[PDB]
Symmetry: D2
Subunit: 141 residues, 4 copies
């Protein structure tokens, strides 16, 4: 039973439930996610919490992250997930399209001190954009 | 457009699984080359078997969502997204019970005001990944 | 060194070179690919040879199949390949677009009696279609 | 003739040739690309030139960006492109694999004062990652 994978599964559940009160349990104080850089300078558990909140706000409370597979190698975990949502909040300067979508994701996670220290994820941006009807942005984010 | 209306009825038939009225919009000589592996049937009967297979393989809850539909003369292009769960044998791959969703592009040719030729391109590789990349147990 | 994997690499090399003199070495007499049922009733090394020729005709002599990875499990091989080409011949009723494209592919091959007996391949149809400029078919026929 | 589309085509040409001496002609002094934030805090023509350099360093001098289609709506341009390269440089902590790859991209560009002022680019991250043999990162750094 991998502690690393169990922690990643808690992370996934956070996206599903939206509940982030306990994230300090598995999110390192120095947690970073380069994908968040455009939105905030926060780090650690508060950074992960703001990501989860953004997901529920933008892609609906009913947004789901489904697990396809999770593997590990030393202090690293690779998660193959699928995001299901509906576009209901402003997304980087694109007005809500109200469109359903689903997009595969690959996540790379690095563990330090038994907690998630670095988190990179690659949404299916283009696939999502297509399913959103390829909206034209209304403003720069 | 009556053509776009017909394609929307086709999409609904996948969603409801109800194929009693398909002769309304499916040409007697309807062909879908993607079906050749499974059957030699044509027309409304062929379309119905395709719909039945989707419900059997991808669950009763399988549905097609519309992204967009375009037309040009006697042709329609439908940009759709299939949502389902792999519950039935899929060309020799055993049921995985896994959820999946994959964009699709459908090209439809109308003759005599009905759908005469139908090509569709599922996201085979994306679906395969979401199904955990199963190894086939047999040749279809 | 897997003989099955070696056979699949010979298959890939045939698409690359267009050289098919020796395909009977590794293609089963009863070889079938369900994806080409629309085009011909051929089977065996004969079917494979014409499929290779069609690729070179439709996607140019310079069309390439690059290997990402190949794995095997008992009598089955899974090949992760990438096709590169330029669309220069009629393709299912769509006129040549002259467009460069590249698309990942997943191939599933079943061996029987030491030769490739069943071959299923999944091109990135939609990705390819996008890169071709999403052409409208001119005919539902071959033309 | 669209001056905007012409400008975006000069941008595309810069990725292809690696020739960036004239980028100030079409890149706004305040040009930003949020995709670059992990790597640099630069803005303007300098940021664009750095991006081009990184592409050539990481994906080889032979890297090419092919045009599928470009459209515009008011002060916005959408470019549908395809990147071709070979993974020859360290890529966010993943060692060079020497592997060929090609992946579609969608770019969204906003013009201000007749120059490219904001640039968002969605590579096919997952498809590229696959073609690179899904490498495990050697560092987070
Ligand atoms: C706080 C800032 C963020 O939370 C936004 C950022 O998280 C974000 C995410 C979160 C994520 O990585 O997957 C759950 C996803 C997307 C995005 C995102 O900013 C996107 O911006 C995005 C897009 O512009 C076009 C298509 C798809 C997407 C996304 O899928
Ligand atoms: C200054 C540094 C940057 O320029 C890096 C950034 O360019 C970057 C680019 C540039 C790009 O937009 O293509 C024309 C592409 C990728 C990436 C990138 O940082 C990637 O990081 C990347 C990846 O991690 C996995 C798969 C693909 C990619 C990229 O395709
Ligand atoms: C009647 C039986 C059929 O025609 C099977 C066939 O419908 C079929 C469909 C339905 C369709 O859209 O083609 C018209 C979809 C898939 C498939 C299919 O046979 C697949 O076989 C399939 C697969 O093997 C791996 C991933 C995805 C798929 C499919 O999405
Ligand atoms: C004899 C005629 C043929 O066999 C056509 C057939 O070869 C074919 C191949 C080759 C192959 O993968 O078969 C084993 C590839 C494609 C296709 C094909 O017929 C396609 O039709 C096709 C398409 O309509 C839209 C996008 C992509 C493709 C293909 O990539």
């Amino acid at each position: 039973r991998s502690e690393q994978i169990a922690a990643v599964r808690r992370m996934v559940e956070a996206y599903n439930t939206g509940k982030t009160d306990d994230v300090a349990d598995y999110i390192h104080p120095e947690y970073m996610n380069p994908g968040t850089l455009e939105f905030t300078s926060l780090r650690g558990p508060e950074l992960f919490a703001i990501n989860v909140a953004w997901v529920k706000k933008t892609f609906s409370e009913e947004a789901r992250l489904e697990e396809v597979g999770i593997e590990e190698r030393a202090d690293w975990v690779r998660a193959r997930l699928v995001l299901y949502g509906r576009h209901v909040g402003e997304m980087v300067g694109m007005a809500p399209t109200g469109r359903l979508f689903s997009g595969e994701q690959i996540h790379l996670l690095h563990f330090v001190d038994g907690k998630i220290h670095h988190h990179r994820d690659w949404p299916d941006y283009q696939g999502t954009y297509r399913q959103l009807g390829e909206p034209w942005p209304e403003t720069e984010h």
